[PDB]
Amino acid sequence: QNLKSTDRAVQQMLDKAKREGIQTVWDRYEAMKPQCGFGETGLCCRHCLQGPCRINPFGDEPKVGICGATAEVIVARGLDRSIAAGAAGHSGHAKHLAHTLKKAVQGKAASYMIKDRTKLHSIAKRLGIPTEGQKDEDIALEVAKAALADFHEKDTPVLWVTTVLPPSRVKVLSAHGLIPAGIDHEIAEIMHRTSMGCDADAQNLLLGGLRCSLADLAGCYMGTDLADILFGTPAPVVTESNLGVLKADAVNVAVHGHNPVLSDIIVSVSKEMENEARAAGATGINVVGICCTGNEVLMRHGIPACTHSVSQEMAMITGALDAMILDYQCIQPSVATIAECTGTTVITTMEMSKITGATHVNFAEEAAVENAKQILRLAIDTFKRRKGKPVEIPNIKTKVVAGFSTEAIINALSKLNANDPLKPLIDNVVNGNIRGVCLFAGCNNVKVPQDQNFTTIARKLLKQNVLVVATGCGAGALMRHGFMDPANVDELCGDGLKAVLTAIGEANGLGGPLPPVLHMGSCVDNSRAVALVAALANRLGVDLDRLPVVASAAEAMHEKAVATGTWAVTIGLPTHIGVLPPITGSLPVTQILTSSVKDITGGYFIVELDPETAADKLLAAINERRAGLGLPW
Amino acid sequence: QNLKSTDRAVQQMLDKAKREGIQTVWDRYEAMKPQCGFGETGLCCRHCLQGPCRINPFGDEPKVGICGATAEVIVARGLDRSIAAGAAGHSGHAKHLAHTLKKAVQGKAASYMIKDRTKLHSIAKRLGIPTEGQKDEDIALEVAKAALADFHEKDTPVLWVTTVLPPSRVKVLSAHGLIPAGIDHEIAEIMHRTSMGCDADAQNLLLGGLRCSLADLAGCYMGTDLADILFGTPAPVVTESNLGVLKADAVNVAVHGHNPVLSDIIVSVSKEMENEARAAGATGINVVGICCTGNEVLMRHGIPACTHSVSQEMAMITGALDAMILDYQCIQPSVATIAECTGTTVITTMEMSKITGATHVNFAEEAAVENAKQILRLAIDTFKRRKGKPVEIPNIKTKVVAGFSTEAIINALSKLNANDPLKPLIDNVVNGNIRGVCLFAGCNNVKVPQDQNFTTIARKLLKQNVLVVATGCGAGALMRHGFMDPANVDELCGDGLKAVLTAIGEANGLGGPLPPVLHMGSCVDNSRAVALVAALANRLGVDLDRLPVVASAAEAMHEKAVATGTWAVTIGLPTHIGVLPPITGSLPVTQILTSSVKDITGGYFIVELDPETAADKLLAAINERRAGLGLPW
Ligand code: SF4
Numbered sequence A, B: 001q002n003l004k005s006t007d008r009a010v011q012q013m014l015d016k017a018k019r020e021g022i023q024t025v026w027d028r029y030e031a032m033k034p035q036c037g038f039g040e041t042g043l044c045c046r047h048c049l050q051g052p053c054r055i056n057p058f059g060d061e062p063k064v065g066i067c068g069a070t071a072e073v074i075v076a077r078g079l080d081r082s083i084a085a086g087a088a089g090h091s092g093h094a095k096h097l098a099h100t101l102k103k104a105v106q107g108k109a110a111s112y113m114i115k116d117r118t119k120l121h122s123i124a125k126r127l128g129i130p131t132e133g134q135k136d137e138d139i140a141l142e143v144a145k146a147a148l149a150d151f152h153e154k155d156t157p158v159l160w161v162t163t164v165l166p167p168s169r170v171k172v173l174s175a176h177g178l179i180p181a182g183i184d185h186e187i188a189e190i191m192h193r194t195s196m197g198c199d200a201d202a203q204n205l206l207l208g209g210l211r212c213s214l215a216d217l218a219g220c221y222m223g224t225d226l227a228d229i230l231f232g233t234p235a236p237v238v239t240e241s242n243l244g245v246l247k248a249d250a251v252n253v254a255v256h257g258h259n260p261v262l263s264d265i266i267v268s269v270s271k272e273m274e275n276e277a278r279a280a281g282a283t284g285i286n287v288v289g290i291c292c293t294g295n296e297v298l299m300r301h302g303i304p305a306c307t308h309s310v311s312q313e314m315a316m317i318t319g320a321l322d323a324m325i326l327d328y329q330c331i332q333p334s335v336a337t338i339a340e341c342t343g344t345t346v347i348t349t350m351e352m353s354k355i356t357g358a359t360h361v362n363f364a365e366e367a368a369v370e371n372a373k374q375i376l377r378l379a380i381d382t383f384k385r386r387k388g389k390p391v392e393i394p395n396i397k398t399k400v401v402a403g404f405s406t407e408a409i410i411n412a413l414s415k416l417n418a419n420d421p422l423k424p425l426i427d428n429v430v431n432g433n434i435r436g437v438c439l440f441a442g443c444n445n446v447k448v449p450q451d452q453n454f455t456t457i458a459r460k461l462l463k464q465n466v467l468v469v470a471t472g473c474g475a476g477a478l479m480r481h482g483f484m485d486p487a488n489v490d491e492l493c494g495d496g497l498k499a500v501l502t503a504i505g506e507a508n509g510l511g512g513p514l515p516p517v518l519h520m521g522s523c524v525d526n527s528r529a530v531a532l533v534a535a536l537a538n539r540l541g542v543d544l545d546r547l548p549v550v551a552s553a554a555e556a557m558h559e560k561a562v563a564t565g566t567w568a569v570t571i572g573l574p575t576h577i578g579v580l581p582p583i584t585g586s587l588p589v590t591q592i593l594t595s596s597v598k599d600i601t602g603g604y605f606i607v608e609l610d611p612e613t614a615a616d617k618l619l620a621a622i623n624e625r626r627a628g629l630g631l632p633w
């Protein structure tokens, strides 16, 4: 099973699924092999009904599409559509939160309120919205209308791009025509230009993709901004992760998906229903996280993380998961059929994301508490049914310190230098105690033994004194293998990095270091890492493509991950991807994305499936950036 | 060659291309066979990097996607994305025209003006915009801002849906949640819901597709509305079609693509440059049309149509095509490589639609006349080079009567009944002289011998007294085979239909009938057919799904055609498609689209590749509608 996942609790559930004859994601993978090489390489097109068109990577015909589309065009068009799909997901989440905030401050949704008024005012100031003498509710209404305006064309560009990146970066992007005009505008323009008989020049197509990737960035940054207003900005928290956070004696309820608009309410209401759950013979309601909605309540409330991404079915295989409460994105639709075998009540809550065989509870912000109780009573009913059934919860969990929003990181640093908080970080970059910064991001992927790339690469970088930050299911991978436990600093970290982590931790009254890896939140919270990196750029007076900062989507899967890797390149970062995107069928596209884009944005992709080699390549990238700054390396 | 195209001028150019070794669309098709059956059936998914996933139509594994997506989900998600792509194209065209109108009335683009102020005021009234005491420029500014607002969410739904369909139809659609909230909003929501781990219920997915198809309808109707304001509403015109409209002695310039914003200006400026073209030894500039931008200048100015869709390369093979002026959509990118062999200057003009190897002239509405001269001087230079080269223009053309906008049709009818113009049409439906109405729409497709389905089905329907209207490359197919020539009424038409066509024609002072088929314009001008059909619904007090009206996308290709077929179903029409869409891999999806959707919208798809069988099925559909109205059939 270790060839499937390096997570020992997942291995145990894989053995249980095997002997119970429950098909898993890995079984469905094996049944798909060998996979189609045309699609793997990107040399397939179904953009009109003359297709499917495919092109032989090598050999004889077919060499070209029926309409005359070249391999270069076909590959670029497919990639563009994946970027637009990802942008649509992140920005649909953000749009949902914009409407929730508008409703909250119009008196239409009383379960929701402004919890972070400091963040509200700072966002308003960044956007140019006056706050002087204005009521919070009116400021928030203006912030929500600005969020919504950024979806369409108007007399300004997308402000959740142009107000979050340094002016020098905006200038470079504007010169190349890369600043988005409107989030949904760009998504639709991608779909138009990539339809049959439209754009057919690889460079032109790919510049459109870079622009649409900044619409994805805008959606991420908007989603984080609005979620912090509504639910509070994360601060350091301590909790646990992996399947052993489930409890046989409790009603186990997993929140799974992306949008905390629901999950945050579930957390509160589950507290109120403790007695209504004890009367059923439970000890309480034990809310646990899966995927990014789990990260959201982990960062804000310390809710323990059950599992992530590719291994989500394994939470059900324990037999102890009484409900799985779903919104949208990254939910394997298999959970609906597995639920029959495992006794789990699967519940969907969003109109545009249903699964045949699941129970649907329409959620409306106006009824949030009402809906939460309806959902949690179905969970309690399910716990009652498994009275006296054995369960198999692996007794495996890690300790997790998290909650490192950019504000939290700056506050932590400010204990060392109160009026120039970024300076102690920069000081230790210059003196070599911190070699550079690596963000791990994105998914797991069934093609890669689960977590293997994240942990192999992180170990090499930590030993070389790289400051490692993580989000999404990259944060999930590292947390489940001990990388968010300060007890593991001595083992994992180079002496320079250990010295900094200990200095900061002890100055925040800890008697111990910060954890080896800093958890910066959900996938939309990749925007927090952008906030930190742009704040360092502004303090140093240099653009992001001169900083010793890199990113790794080490086991990417979702179209969202492709969009996010692309905006990391577009804002100036060397960006590793550890699974093959469908680009190898065109050398000219590959050369643009891994080489000549450097001349446009300063970032570039590093496509590398071997994780030891990837770690070497990321270190070289960091160290080239150090050299360009005149720093030893 | 008759197995490739039924167009004899295309057959002649196919022989020339063969002996010159110029590869064509049909050669590239043959080189693609056998095509992938997974993609043909819709049983392939590449929506994340765990894929490609495919499902065997029959047999053993694979049976399901890696994430657990069923055949039903995979097929519905692929279809939804095609609908969103089509909507993006039609509505991107409309958006372009909204910005052009705004610029024109702000004094930013003096080559453009309000040419149809009656249409402007009628549109304003339909939208609820006051006109009483307001300047035209201010009315138009309000109309353009309303067009742009319909792309995003706001306090009203998409008005280019809710103000163009009868209230009873809107009510049915609203009850099912099918009215779009915003055009780009719906496109983006499609892309989100169809991404990995989101919507996974075939009915839910397909209802989203129906809603997005009405966003495509809104884009079409907006594009027609704005283009009529700017360039004039079509009235009856007489011209010619097919390759023989090219002239060896002239500078032949083809306008190709979709948006008339450019082409309309080319037509005017080419008139001004006649002398500058005679000085080069031409007789003049001979502007000809390809695809829908050709239809646009055909409908408004009588510009002759050179060719359409699948046969576009053949215009270049004559050797006499000095320039091909491109905007976007439905342009085979092969034209750029063929141009080297044929001496043709291929010019692109829109930033989001370039072709490697073409010459790019950035077009800006503010410089329109300037750009037009630059482009037309490159054309003249190319004519000079082919001095003394032989050309092979097939001496094959048809006569074409066209320009039947809905206003033109109503005015024609009003000669028989001035104050109740729709009544003579309804009278002849009731008495059987007109059996019903069929709209032919959409493309040609290399899978189908060119034009064969359109002409086979049209002949059967005309002999049965069906009133046939056509747009796009369906209009192109029929015009090139004589169906727009009144001289062919006796041969083609049933006695009842001939009697009506003659009665109307003679009352419009013609001494002859209307043509056998009424050309209603470009693809966006399918909206004109909706205007006519909704006007008949309102006069009769019944919804569209009780009228004896059907549609046929007899040789569909483009994602736009899929979107348009879907909104034809959604507004209540039996809708034939004559090529296989990628749905046969899921029986449940097929049954929804061809059967149970009747219970939702009253329309339905008729998937039928044999054209004689298709004509029978369309007649049965018409005659079932007649019976439901109590009419003989
Ligand atoms: S757009 Fe061109 S390459 Fe793609 S399926 Fe259609 S003919 Fe083939």
Ligand code: SF4
Pocket: B045, B046, B047, B048, B049, B050, B051, B052, B053, B065, B066, B067, B068, B069, B074, B195, B196, B197
């Ligand atoms: S979304 Fe599911 S079916 Fe599609 S490629 Fe990814 S794993 Fe396969």
Ligand code: FES
Pocket: A036, A037, A038, A039, A040, A044, A045, A052, A054, B036, B039, B044, B046, B052
């Ligand atoms: S030929 Fe396999 S992805 Fe299309």
Ligand code: FES
Pocket: A036, A039, A044, A046, A052, B036, B037, B038, B039, B040, B044, B045, B052, B054
């Ligand atoms: S397996 Fe051929 S279209 Fe994907």
Ligand SMILES: [Fe+2]
Pocket: A257, A258, A291, A292, A329, A330, A472, A523
């Ligand atoms: Fe996520």
Ligand SMILES: [Fe+2]
Pocket: B257, B258, B291, B292, B329, B330, B472, B523
């Ligand atoms: Fe068209």
